Amino acid sequence: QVQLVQSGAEVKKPGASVKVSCKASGYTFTDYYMHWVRQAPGQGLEWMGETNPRNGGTTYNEKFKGKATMTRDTSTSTAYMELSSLRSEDTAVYYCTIGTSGYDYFDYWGQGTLVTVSSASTKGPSVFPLAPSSKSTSGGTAALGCLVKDYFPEPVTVSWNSGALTSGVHTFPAVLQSSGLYSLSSVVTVPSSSLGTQTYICNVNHKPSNTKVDKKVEPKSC
Amino acid sequence: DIVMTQTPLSLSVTPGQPASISCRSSQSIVHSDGNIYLEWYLQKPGQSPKLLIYKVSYRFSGVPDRFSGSGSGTGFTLKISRVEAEDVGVYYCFQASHVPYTFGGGTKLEIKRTVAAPSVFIFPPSDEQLKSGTASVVCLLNNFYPREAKVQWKVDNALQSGNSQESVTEQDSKDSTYSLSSTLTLSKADYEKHKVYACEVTHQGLSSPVTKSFNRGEC
Numbered sequence: 001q002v003q004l005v006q007s008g009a010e011v012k013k014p015g016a017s018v019k020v021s022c023k024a025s026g027y028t029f030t031d032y033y034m035h036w037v038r039q040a041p042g043q044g045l046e047w048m049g050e051t052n053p054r055n056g057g058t059t060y061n062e063k064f065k066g067k068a069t070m071t072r073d074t075s076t077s078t079a080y081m082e083l084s085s086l087r088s089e090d091t092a093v094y095y096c097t098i099g100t101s102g103y104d105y106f107d108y109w110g111q112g113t114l115v116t117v118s119s120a121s122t123k124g125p126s127v128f129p130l131a132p133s134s135k136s137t138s139g140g141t142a143a144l145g146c147l148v149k150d151y152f153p154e155p156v157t158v159s160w161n162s163g164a165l166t167s168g169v170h171t172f173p174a175v176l177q178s179s180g181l182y183s184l185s186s187v188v189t190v191p192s193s194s195l196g197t198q199t200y201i202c203n204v205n206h207k208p209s210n211t212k213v214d215k216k217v218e219p220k221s222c
Numbered sequence: 223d224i225v226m227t228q229t230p231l232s233l234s235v236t237p238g239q240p241a242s243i244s245c246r247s248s249q250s251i252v253h254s255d256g257n258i259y260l261e262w263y264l265q266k267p268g269q270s271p272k273l274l275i276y277k278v279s280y281r282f283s284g285v286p287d288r289f290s291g292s293g294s295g296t297g298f299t300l301k302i303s304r305v306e307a308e309d310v311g312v313y314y315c316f317q318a319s320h321v322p323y324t325f326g327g328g329t330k331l332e333i334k335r336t337v338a339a340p341s342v343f344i345f346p347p348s349d350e351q352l353k354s355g356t357a358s359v360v361c362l363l364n365n366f367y368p369r370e371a372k373v374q375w376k377v378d379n380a381l382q383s384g385n386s387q388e389s390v391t392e393q394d395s396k397d398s399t400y401s402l403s404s405t406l407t408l409s410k411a412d413y414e415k416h417k418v419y420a421c422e423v424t425h426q427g428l429s430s431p432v433t434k435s436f437n438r439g440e441c
């Protein structure tokens with residue numbers, strides 16, 4: 001039951017600050033050091049530092065000193081990573097992680113947090129159904145989906161029937177539109193025989209704009 | 223700082239065949255307690271890294287027998303005796319013997335499965351998008367191998383240019399295939415000037431190109 005739950009994606013302005021949280025549960029929070037790892041484009045993975053949850057003691061990677069500040073709240077069992085003097089190089093996925101066997105390994109990780117550094121404004125997505133029809137059938141199967149357009153920044157998450165539909169789902173990486181906004185598609189293959197009895201809803205979440213869109217996808221006569 | 227040099231950058235292996243990933247530290251990585259804290263992690267796109275090997279050669283709980291680790295001094299190796307579909311993603315070696323802890327550059331493992339032809343699907347624009355004055359047509363290329371596939375958008379048999387965007391998925395962890403989504407976007411005014419909306423697909427698995435089309439006004 002050990003879980004590391006990170007805060008949603010954020011967009012911040014150049015030179016400003018972002019505070020990423022890591023809520024721990026299923027273990028005694030003060031028993032294990034909390035680590036922060038950065039996954040930046042063309043940079044692979046980088047260990048930023050460790051935090052002793054008992055005393056707030058920290059050990060930073062020199063590269064992240066003065067830039068990053070690690071703290072924790074023992075009352076809510078939440079670790080925090082704050083980044084200051086934000087620049088394009090800080091646009092990355094940030095992970096919190098722990099080791100439950102001394103200094104042997106990182107066995108538990110958070111789901112990651114995408115921090116975007118931009119002066120541009122946050123824009124919620126436009127969700128359109130990709131209706132199944134005779135033109136989206138193949139060997140007893142029917143494809144359907146959702147077209148998620150004109151959002152900013154990344155990411156948007158897509159689930160189907162609130163996570164109950166995962167088999168045959170393909171959620172594609174976003175493409176960048178000429179305007180600077182993003183677009184993605186999410187598809188699924190289902191039996192073509194049960195389009196009359198099954199409800200297919202794509203659940204689109206965009207944390208920067210605090211948007212949640214549930215689009216029901218209905219069949220068409222192509 | 224300890225520099226961890228991972229080789230090769232990319233690998234393509236047929237299932238049931240062995241794979242070897244090498245890692246090289248710029249200096250020795252013996253911690254003050256005498257242990258070499260050298261670990262291997264697997265990361266799939268969108269997901270967090272997953273532990274495989276630790277202390278050079280110890281296999282973490284639940285990791286299959288096929289994964290083994292070895293090494294001495296500055297040279298360390300991850301070995302997968304028989305590669306499986308589920309092994310896809312980026313492998314990283316990592317050292318925690320000396321502060322700051324450092325990762326290798328990563329090695330992308332690709333599964334070398336049999337040629338699979340894509341299944342082609344087309345989607346008309348929705349009424350809700352048309353209301354805003356735009357019409358996006360989506361062509362889906364599902365479960366194909368190899369990754370190289372060509373989509374050509376044809377409107378009343380006329381080849382389109384500069385009005386489409388496409389994206390390919392990472393390799394599938396169950397069937398070792400790729401999927402491709404292409405979006406043709408034109409104004410409602412241009413959309414209503416034509417009948418046939420077609421995506422022509424070429425792939426090594428198809429003997430001749432496959433056309434999937436719909437007629438505007440039939441949906």
Ligand SMILES: Cn1c(CNc2ccc(C(=N)N)cc2)nc2cc(C(=O)N(CCC(=O)O)c3ccccn3)ccc21
Pocket residue numbers: 030031032033050052053054098099100102103104105106259261318
């Ligand atoms: C530096 N460090 C780490 C780093 N973690 C780590 C995990 C994995 C990896 C890796 N991936 N190889 C690399 C590093 N864990 C530590 C645990 C102790 C410890 O002795 N105590 C008791 C100390 C007291 O209070 O007397 C302790 C226990 C919980 C909280 C605070 N202190 C000391 C030092 C530690």
